[PDB]
Symmetry: D3
Subunit: 248 residues, 6 copies
């Protein structure tokens, strides 16, 4: 039984859930669900692993998106079909501002659209903006947890390498568009790079769905040295769960 093409889920599986937490990694799904009550694995197909748990007595979904806008768009669309109206992405990220430290938490108000999938939902002029209630819940939850928090703009790239201006690659070249791009984003106050939010935020904001994004800073592109990255993971994970409580 499945109501959707990819996820292998039915509306019954959701038990009336209307909020989903959407990490990138299928392996993080169980870990996030473990922060809630009565978590049960629902399905695992391709990069889409899903669990249901209870939060303050209400059903909540945790479902992985895989890496990138394309797989993210599938998860979000199919979750929406199933009844999800609110999406919270939780990630781990590399900061590009020297003042943003490993262990810090980043809440994304909106994203630089360095992706392709967002364009499948809205023209480039449209902002990849987070829902206000979601952003509020994340900011507030970060205060409840105790994190050092930065709130602002994230660059959301379709690649891990040239789109984030990495030169440590097979070709060692970066196409003209992205040459000198990291310095530009830095100067514009962009906090970090990741790979899913442009798609998530655009597709939700343009379709009457609520979306927020929080991430833990595990590395800094400007710093030479590369605590536990699982400690920063757990901080961000606790925040997304606490935020979800306020959006139910």
């Amino acid at each position: 039984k499945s109501d959707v093409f990819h996820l292998g889920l039915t509306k019954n599986d959701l038990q009336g859930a209307q909020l989903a937490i959407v990490p990138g990694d299928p392996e993080r799904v169980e870990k996030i669900a473990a922060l809630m009550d009565k978590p049960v694995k629902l399905a695992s197909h391709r990069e889409f692993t899903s669990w249901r748990a209870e939060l303050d007595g209400k059903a909540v979904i945790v479902c992985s998106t895989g890496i990138g806008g394309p797989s993210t768009s599938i998860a979000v669309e199919e979750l929406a079909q199933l009844g999800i109206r609110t999406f919270l992405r939780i990630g781990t990220t590399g900061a590009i501002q020297p003042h943003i430290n490993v262990g810090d938490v980043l809440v994304t108000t909106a994203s630089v659209r360095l992706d392709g999938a967002s364009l499948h939902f809205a023209p480039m002029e449209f902002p990849a903006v987070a829902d206000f209630a979601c952003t509020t819940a994340l900011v507030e939850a970060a205060k409840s947890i105790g994190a050092t928090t930065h709130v602002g703009v994230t660059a959301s790239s379709d690649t891990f390498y040239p789109g984030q201006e990495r030169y440590d690659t097979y070709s060692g070249r970066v196409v003209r568009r992205f040459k000198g791009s990291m310095e530009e984003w830095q100067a514009m106050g962009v906090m970090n790079y990741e790979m899913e939010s442009a798609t998530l935020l655009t597709m939700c904001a343009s379709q009457g769905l609520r979306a927020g994004m929080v991430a833990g800073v595990i590395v800094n592109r400007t710093q030479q040295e590369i605590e536990t990255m699982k400690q920063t993971e757990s901080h961000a994970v606790k925040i997304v769960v606490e935020a979800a409580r306020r959006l139910l």
Copy 2:
């Protein structure tokens, strides 16, 4: 006399002000200022009328932007040069959603960039996004006075006519880009049209400046002013 090319203001005129309320219309400037302590006229040059006031013992600027991104970009830049770090735009607006009514208050989280000036600060991929603290202050101020408030996306157009898909014009034509565009924005949940936010929000978000926007709905495309005005002043109070 002036530390800036257009505004006719010095840093001294601001008296340490770091926040400016920025209406479009010079006429609205004094009225906004009058809701605060010790309001005084500063200068008037072209579409840039500026007043100073005080909230909770802190200096606040009110300065008009004129219509559109170009004049807004001038005002925001020169205010930034003089020490303004937080900008709160206040406008009146026409809603494009069936369930956004006249007398409603709109708080803009981000704008569709249907302008040219925003591109002079950041490429199109960059979001014309409002500052979270500003958006928070505006939403909370709106709730504190019991206004019917909608929070979300605004379409910000370089024109009043074709860019907002108006056909009641000299030519009666709308360029291909904008034909059917209102229905598209509507389907995407865009609240309203105005003409300055894409520029304001992009230029601030990409230059380490805080910006927010609130507007009063006075008409639907499918008393009010003084309520939006009360909201922007109360929001400013929370951001000093």
Copy 3:
């Protein structure tokens, strides 16, 4: 009682006028109208100050546009609704060519579209070109009073600062698009920057309206009252030929 949303004007106020002189600054409107017969103030709303005057017995309008394409597009549209078919922009301007000196007069044949409002009327492919009759009248008017005239392309920018590649700013930053752009326009023979012509010329050329532009060189970044009056006489003299 107004027929249009912003200008506060009726068709009757124009008294059959079909040409408008469109300066940027409301404060310059009377000064221009004062060079013609029977100058009367019509209205003043926002940046749109309008006067009516009379030239060779025909009614003419002088109306300010404010700064930038957006406000210009409002003034032009609403003036067209009221019957205006010919628009003559007058400005004062800097220059980006070293051979162009303060005192010189610039007549614009077409503009580099560094604005956004022009795109609301025609796709970028469409030329921001001046009307031939208006340009002819302006060039001939400049010759009649013996002004040193440069005829060519103007870069029309939605910003005063980064789009004209100014670095003396709060951020000191210019976006990639405009980094090295002034040198590029200079090498392409562009005369100057201003902020309204791309919108004016495109919206008129694509809607059967006639537009032209003249400007006095007051400053040169590469390198004012006398130049002002020169440009104003030219635009008024050109208007006579176009009535």
Copy 4:
């Protein structure tokens, strides 16, 4: 030869600084024959060049072939040889109902529906004709008494889909061009041709003077009109020497 395509040297031009540039190589001699001392210089590919004399001054007539790409080659190489003024004389399909077959169209600027113009200036730059050239063409058309329209021309890299012709092998027009002719008509565009956007953009952005005149061969809504526009371009050339 001093140049790669045209097969010409600086001396072949004998001090010439103006070139009349038709599209068709076969039209070159005809135009040259209207002036004094017409002499064939060279013929390579679509580039046939003649020299002639106008009021004692050497003038070049050189074909461009069809399209911006070959036009850009001819213009560049002539510029290398010393040409500073270029006058295009062409054939055109009018798209305005009031413009009759046989009429003369003087182009102030072009809608850039080409690719070559972008190799000289970004799309924001106007494909605008030189004022002196345009003035000379208009004044020449008046002296000949020709029915003349002055304005904007759509300049297309294709004869078929870019001019929204459906009478084709596929009968398909790509989205960009579907409904485009009506759009250009509403915007007051006079006509279609295939070289002006490149010519005007490359000249205006490089300090070269260019003008564009054409005779109407079809209305998108016979023998005498060619010579009519040809007479105009030669008369205009006289005013630009």
Copy 5:
């Protein structure tokens, strides 16, 4: 225990492998590997499941890409870092031509770039073109195995839904860019939709890596709404 960030693989793990077969689905990796000599599981991290096998005495990698250009670009880059120089994608696909049947095999010569990741390697002007030797090996392999084969252009979309003009979605809205797009690709002779080839082909063709693309038709859109695997393995034999 890993020379690359995401795959969890070391250069040692590859055993001299220079060719990788790259399916979308992690769960298909073992199946493909099983068709060859000495299949050994290497790693499984995120959507990246990798096996090593042997084909005519030579080491060959099978590694999943996950869905979409972004995850594909990571797999290809890190596999290239470990020494892979030839990539053969084996996928599933929806045909958009009436004459192409379910169960048919499609060899892609080049792709319509309806993706974003390809632009991170080459501007849009650059063709998302397959390697000639890889395409030849696939066509030749198809003759060998015996399948109804179509060779041509593929539309490669960053989405499963709006980019493939699907309307049975939550919003039922397809953005302007993609309204009527399927009929357009159909008239242009495009065979099919999938989601990875534009990224794969562009990133390889612009980086001196060889890439080929083959897929089995699982649905025909003009109605709704193992051959291919044998062919990719046989093609790999011809390319070692």
Copy 6:
């Protein structure tokens, strides 16, 4: 005439469904002369056309002139007349250091630095050659043992700035093309010419088969401008596609 520019009727083709399309009008006769019963058909503007016979089948040779625009006219009108397969035979500037003058380059697909291709398909559509045509060209090349390279070609609307030549009147290259040759080179692009982007796009998007082959006349790593192997190959490839 059945078509506006070429001056040809379907009868002139004698059932030909394949055309060999050089850029230069003066090359048409030379190509035709390598086949049986060569007959001149017409010469209008840059479009010179001949008919010939290959293995008892009629073949057209027709010049395109330089550039996408005139190419698009020739291909379209030939298509109207019944041509379904087009083989471009051109000259080219190599941008890779180890490609020799005289080498034969077979194009798999083109970088669309042209304008005409966009009149047939949006930029995301690949300017890709037909597989059968490309195969025939490669296999003809090995049959005569010519030094051959197969891969991507940059196809430009200009000879000068779009191919980043600086020895020009202005000596300037617009921002878009500054540093472009190094970029294409790094991307493994073999060569520059001016027609293939248009040809390949317009054919691949309209159910017409196209192949592209060119002889190297200059190596751009060394010089901008120079101080019948490819022709044999295109004729031999044509035999295989009849």
